[PDB]
Amino acid sequence: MRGKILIFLHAHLPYVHHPEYDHFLEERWLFEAITETYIPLLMMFDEIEDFRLTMSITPPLMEMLSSRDLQEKYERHMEKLIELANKEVERTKKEHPLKHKMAKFYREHFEKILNVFRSYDGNILEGFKKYQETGKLEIVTCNATHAFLPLYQMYPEVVNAQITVGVKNYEKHMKKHPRGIWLAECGYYQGLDLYLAQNNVEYFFVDSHAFWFADEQPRYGVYRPIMTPSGVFAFARDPESSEQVWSAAVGYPGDPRYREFYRDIGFDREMEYIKDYIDPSGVRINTGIKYHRITSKSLDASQKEYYDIDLAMEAVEEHARDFLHKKESQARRLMDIMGVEPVIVAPFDAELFGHWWFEGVFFLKRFFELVNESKDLKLVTASEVIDTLEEVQIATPADSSWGATNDWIYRHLHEMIERMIDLSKKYYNSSDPLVERVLNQMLRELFLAQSSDWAFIMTTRTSVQYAENRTKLHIKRFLNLYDQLVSGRIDEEMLRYYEWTDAIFPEINFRVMARDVI
Amino acid sequence: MRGKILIFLHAHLPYVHHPEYDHFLEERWLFEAITETYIPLLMMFDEIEDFRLTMSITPPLMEMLSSRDLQEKYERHMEKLIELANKEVERTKKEHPLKHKMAKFYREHFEKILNVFRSYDGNILEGFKKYQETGKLEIVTCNATHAFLPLYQMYPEVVNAQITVGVKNYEKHMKKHPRGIWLAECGYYQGLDLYLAQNNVEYFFVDSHAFWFADEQPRYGVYRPIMTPSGVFAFARDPESSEQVWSAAVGYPGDPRYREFYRDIGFDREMEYIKDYIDPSGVRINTGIKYHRITSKSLDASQKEYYDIDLAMEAVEEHARDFLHKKESQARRLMDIMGVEPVIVAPFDAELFGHWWFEGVFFLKRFFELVNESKDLKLVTASEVIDTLEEVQIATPADSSWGATNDWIYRHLHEMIERMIDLSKKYYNSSDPLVERVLNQMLRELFLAQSSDWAFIMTTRTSVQYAENRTKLHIKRFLNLYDQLVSGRIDEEMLRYYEWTDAIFPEINFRVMARDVI
Secondary structure, three states, X not given: OOEEEEEEEEEOOOOOOOOOOOOOHHHHHHHHHHHHHHHHHHHHHHHOOOOOXXXXXXXXXXXXXXXXXXXXXXXXXXXXXXXXXXXXXXXXXXXXXXXXXXXXXXXXXXXXXXXXXXHOOOOOHHHHHHHHHXXXXXXXXXXXXXXXXXXXXXXXXXXXXXXXXXXXXXXXXXXXXXXXXXXXXXXXXXXXXXXXXXXXXXXXEEOOHHHHOOOOOXXXXXXXXXXXXXXXXXXXXXXXXXXXXXXXOOOHHXXXXXXXXXXXXXXXXXXXXXXXXXXXXXXXXXOOOOOEEOOOOOOOHHHOOEOOHHHHHXXXXXXXXXXXXXXXXXXXXXXXXXXXXXXXXXXXXXHHEOOXXXXXXHHHHHXXXXXXXXXOEEEOOHHHHXXXXXXXXXXXXXXXXXXOOOOHHHHHHHHHHHHHXXXXXXXXXXXXXXXXXXXXXXXXXXXXXXXXXXXXXXXXXXXXXXXXXXXXXXXXXXXXXXXXXXXXXXXXXXXXXXXXXXXXXXXXXXXXXXXXXX | OOEEEEEEEEEXXXXXXXXXXXXXXXXXXXXXXXXXXXXXXXXXHHHOOXXXXXXXXXXXXXXXXXOXXXXXXXXXXXXXXXXXXXXXXXXXXXXXXXXXXXXXXXXXXXXXXXXXXXXXXXXXXXXXXHHHHHOOXXXXXXXXXXXXXXXXXXXXXXXXXXXXXXXXXXXXXXXXXXXXXXXXXXXEOOOHHHHHHHOOOOEEEEOOHHHHOOOOOOOOHHHOOEEOOOOOEEEEOOHHHOHHHHOOOOOHHHOOOOEOOOOOHHHHOOHHHHHHHOOOOOOOOOOXXXXXXXXXXXXXXXXXXXXXXXXXXXXXXXXXXXXXXXXXXXXXXHHHHHOOOOEEEEEEEHHHEOOOEOOXXXXXXXXXXXXXXXXXXXXXXXXXXXXXXXXXXEOOOOOEOOOOOOOHHHHHHHHHHHHHHHHHHHOOOOOOHHHHHHHHHHHHHHHXXXXXXXXXXXXXXXHHHHHHHHHHHHHHHHXXXXXXXXXXXXXXXXXXXXXXXXXXXXXXXXXXXXXXXX
């Protein structure tokens, strides 16, 4: 028998859509994610012989990747960047040979990336869809807005609508019902499996504490899924495969041979040279072309040496065999103690691979190829395991998450949900398409204000600032519509403005909020 | 055989000393910690028949508790508060009976607290010292300033000086060498055990990942200490006893019968009534007298019901038996799989008990009494276990922590450490007591700038604001002294100002920075 390795990547970005501007600072997050992570995954799926991988692509992120104005902006961003790449291959010619060499790597690579983007007429969802069809990739949905559902457990209508909207949104893009779901922050509370069952969801992921703190602990601990009484399968995180293994402070990515994130030519190159690749404001930002390796544990960032991609590859080769040997060792020990095949569930934030850690997808590819050769280990997707397992225990998971004033926001959320439900029931049978448009945008506004991102975020250079500004912006938009509706004075131009800027789920139906609960 | 339960409380606050003001906002953190957590622990140690508990009291916190100007300010704060308590027992008389009843609880309780403080001539360290002498309490030290040591691993001089200064500071207050140490954030890197051995430290605590990710995993996992090759014992966190069990979102403290933190009369009572118990600025803040229970998962905080302390006690009784039954169950399972007694290591932030969770120390007391009666379980301190264990495996822990630009700060830290070392060696043999005073305050300034608190803090209502302001303030003070020294123009009045405001380790000796490493 072989141990089963289930690698899970969580691919999420908040819905950030600013069509009122031509370059916006927080739309670059999306572009870096596409360049650094999503397309290099595609490249890696194409190049590798075989893999098995499960991932989320959250509805906000599907809605952005499919938006053909973002695709146009990305294409223009990629050209600006290939232009810079060229400027850089000449300017580097008389500088360090490593630095010169990298600039040419960067030119070829960026060309390759934009070319893959073009292969798919700029919808890279089509690429992910195509790997799902092979069965090598398994893509799960997420709640509609990546709201943290345990915060809203007293408002089952918004919770279940969060789920349904995600499910339908996935169907729309993927042309297939989702089988599994990733809850934002693994936020799970008791009873939530019922709504998942109502939504025809087959499996979700929980934190380890969901099994440890259950009334009776699952017999095989976190190394086999359980089935809830409702028939929904839960997969618990292997805490031995935690966040720390990917830490720069203590894990593989902190290796001195790896590319340094916080050195970039947008901070180093002379201002007149670099002007129209930074912010139009004139402020220095990251470009994506970076020449230094981490070098050492020094606090003196000026002492950083130039990146050598061959040593970097030597590091991934070592790390990938370290991790392999650790999983084989863990598998063998578990088989011997358990008597059935362990399934080792290891979820990571997607951007950790290729974005925070430049060499991450290279690592992923080498680890897959190694697991493929291993006689102790098999890659599985999560739907393969639910389709294959015969013994599975039945258990109920404990409230939990994978977890890490300011209450003007909360009482406003409370009133918005309460009002949204009232009005959805009140206008359930309306055929007025203006009232419907209004109610539909109210729900979008409400969902947009629920993003966990704006609350206790995974915002890189975010800072509780653009975030609480985001939340209040959507609260205010919702209240404006509420006021126009409640008083006969629907303002059609404002409504169209809102429909345009906050365009997330075009197919939504406010009537989701009028359904029964409990 | 019985399972061994090792409860660990981490008691830390940053050094915040503002003698230039008469009330300062961030000196109230200390007062709430004393009132809500440190004295009620003392009360609980006195009242319980028997307990075993290990805790840190970090050097910044010992230095504040012993400062007899803070003790005077606390005494005056406690009287202001007992005065408010009295105003409240009358004003409540015709309001809800729960609310009236609580106000009288609050009067008696605050009187009791200030009275314990007086029992000890206002040094409550004397109380903690007295329980260490019984052997029921074990108090470990921490690095001098709760700096995160893996950030500084390339500067072994500052690392080892962080350790030594803590060790000596503990000796000064406790009149005993410390046997164990708690590293800030369990930040551990390979080699750090050597410096601990050099400092005569017998045991430290690491994160679970320190064992899981070791070259060979410890045979008994996290349920027995290991000994490093250097002879230093490491105790790994039981991840089944994690932070989540004390979560308000998913754990016991979130029970609707428990006292609500974010309702306080300083926000509710009328302004003219409440004026001289809030900020002198006139801004509303917490008073410490709070009348509501959590009530429900509602986002509508206005719907909160009044606190009933008897139901709250019924909740602690249930929770304490839940936790007991979970630890007995875990013990029995482990004994049967291991063949020796497990030691279950469960560390918590101290303020989680009594401060975030009002009923926390009550819970602690009931859990101890229950464990005391249990036939499956024994309370142990960490020094009891190192003194008792005969089989212990030898292993080397992996880099790890219990873990969760902006680089002007870093290059300044780099230069300050580098300069501090130079000058400590250069003036090693000086007998000039002015140069010595200067060098001694430079080191304080440097250490104060290293506080992890100011970096990725455990700041409640802190916000990366008072924090980076703190860091830069100490950087600037250090550079001022550096400049005066390097140029002959030591400014004695400024130096005395610094000695007064930043008075942390009076006994320090800058020569710690001139020692060998490696």
